Swiss-Prot record, chain A:
It catalyses: RNA(n) + a ribonucleoside 5'-triphosphate = RNA(n+1) + diphosphate. Transmembrane segments: none annotated. The RNAP catalytic core consists of 2 alpha, 1 beta, 1 beta' and 1 omega subunit. When a sigma factor is associated with the core the holoenzyme is formed, which can initiate transcription. The rRNA transcription and antitermination complex (rrnTAC) consists of RNAP, NusA, NusB, NusE (rpsJ), NusG, SubB, ribosomal protein S4, DNA and precursor rRNA; S4 is more flexible than other subunits. It comes from Escherichia coli (strain K12). GO terms for biological process: bacterial-type flagellum assembly; bacterial-type flagellum-dependent cell motility; cell motility; cellular response to cell envelope stress; DNA-templated transcription initiation; intracellular iron ion homeostasis; nitrate assimilation; protein-containing complex assembly. Keywords: DNA-directed RNA polymerase, Nucleotidyltransferase, Transcription, Transferase. The keyword Nucleotidyltransferase applies. This is DNA-directed RNA polymerase subunit omega. GO terms for molecular function: bacterial-type RNA polymerase core enzyme binding; DNA binding; DNA-directed RNA polymerase activity. Its EC number is 2.7.7.6. The chain holds residues 2 to 75 of 91 of the full protein.
Curated annotation (Swiss-Prot), chain B:
Co-administration of salinamide and rifampicin or salinamide and myxopyronin suppresses the emergence of resistance to both antibiotics. Belongs to the RNA polymerase beta chain family. The RNAP catalytic core consists of 2 alpha, 1 beta, 1 beta' and 1 omega subunit. When a sigma factor is associated with the core the holoenzyme is formed, which can initiate transcription. The rRNA transcription and antitermination complex (rrnTAC) consists of RNAP, NusA, NusB, NusE (rpsJ), NusG, SubB, ribosomal protein S4, DNA and precursor rRNA; S4 is more flexible than other subunits. In pull-down experiments interacts with CedA. (Microbial infection) Interacts (via flap domain) with Escherichia phage lambda antitermination protein Q; this interaction renders bacterial RNAP resistant to transcription pausing and allows it to read through termination signals. Acetylated on several lysine residues in the presence of glucose. DNA-dependent RNA polymerase (RNAP) catalyzes the transcription of DNA into RNA using the four ribonucleoside triphosphates as substrates. Resistance to the antibiotics salinamide A, salinamide B, rifampicin, streptolydigin, CBR703, myxopyronin, and lipiarmycin can result from mutations in this protein. This is DNA-directed RNA polymerase subunit beta.
From Swiss-Prot, chain C:
Co-administration of salinamide and rifampicin or salinamide and myxopyronin suppresses the emergence of resistance to both antibiotics. DNA-dependent RNA polymerase (RNAP) catalyzes the transcription of DNA into RNA using the four ribonucleoside triphosphates as substrates. The RNAP catalytic core consists of 2 alpha, 1 beta, 1 beta' and 1 omega subunit. When a sigma factor is associated with the core the holoenzyme is formed, which can initiate transcription. The rRNA transcription and antitermination complex (rrnTAC) consists of RNAP, NusA, NusB, NusE (rpsJ), NusG, SubB, ribosomal protein S4, DNA and precursor rRNA; S4 is more flexible than other subunits. Transmembrane segments: none annotated. Belongs to the RNA polymerase beta' chain family. Acetylated on several lysine residues in the presence of glucose. This is DNA-directed RNA polymerase subunit beta'. The gene is rpoC.
């Protein structure tokens, strides 16, 4: 598991929106319909989402963009 | 985990289905407080 | 009772009330219950008393007159603005718990 959560903090900075972003990612990951962009290592959805936000590949912005993407694609 | 009677069952179902979603609703002790306050000569209600 | 020589809100004990009724007849009405206080407060216009208190506070100024009067005005303002009729303070019906 992860020992320190700092890369996600640096990617976010506010320290309060990161939890919301990771939670809204993990909820959709666990309900299904999406795939993990980061290769998993037999870990739960929350750790995968937090490693994704730490890697700098997902944030509070592109989620809205992709969500409007499938919303208009319907 | 509180006196929310309509929440404990739903959280149990969300766990066993692996949903992990929570809706707060309202604690029943707050309704207890309202009922015991209305027992005396004091109106109390919650607006919209 | 304004015809009789008696204050509107004054104490009149059992012997005193007896002799007052004997002398003034059936004119100086009196009650000894919570309904007495209820009648005393229901037949009392709040706006007139508020204006009188405001005039007294504005005109008469003293170390003790400054206090014990402004809080009365505030209570009157709260009562009139809240809309809660002061007769509701003396309850008639009593709720009980389930």
């Amino acid at each position: 598991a992860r020992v320190t959560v700092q890369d996600a903090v640096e990617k976010i900075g506010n320290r309060f929106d990161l939890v919301l972003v990771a939670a809204r990612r993990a909820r959709q990951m666990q309900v299904g319909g999406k795939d993990p962009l980061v290769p998993e290592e037999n870990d739960k959805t929350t750790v995968i989402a937090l490693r994704e936000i730490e890697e700098g590949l997902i944030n509070n912005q592109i989620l809205d963009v992709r969500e409007r993407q499938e919303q208009q694609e319907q | 985990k509180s006196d929310d009677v309509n929440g404990r069952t739903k959280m149990y179902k969300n766990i066993v289905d692996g949903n992990h979603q929570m809706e707060p609703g309202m604690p029943e002790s707050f309704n207890v407080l309202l009922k015991e306050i209305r027992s005396l000569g004091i109106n109390i209600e919650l607006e919209d | 009772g304004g015809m009789t020589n008696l204050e509107r809100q004054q104490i009149l004990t059992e012997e005193q009330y007896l002799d007052a009724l004997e002398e003034f007849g059936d004119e100086f009405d009196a009650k000894m219950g919570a309904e007495a206080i209820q009648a005393l407060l229901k037949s009392m216009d709040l706006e007139q008393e508020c204006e009188q208190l405001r005039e007294e506070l504005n005109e008469t100024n003293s170390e003790t007159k400054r206090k014990k009067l402004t809080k009365r005005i505030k209570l009157l303002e709260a009562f009139v603005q809240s809309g809660n009729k002061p007769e509701w303070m003396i309850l008639t019906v009593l709720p009980v718990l389930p």
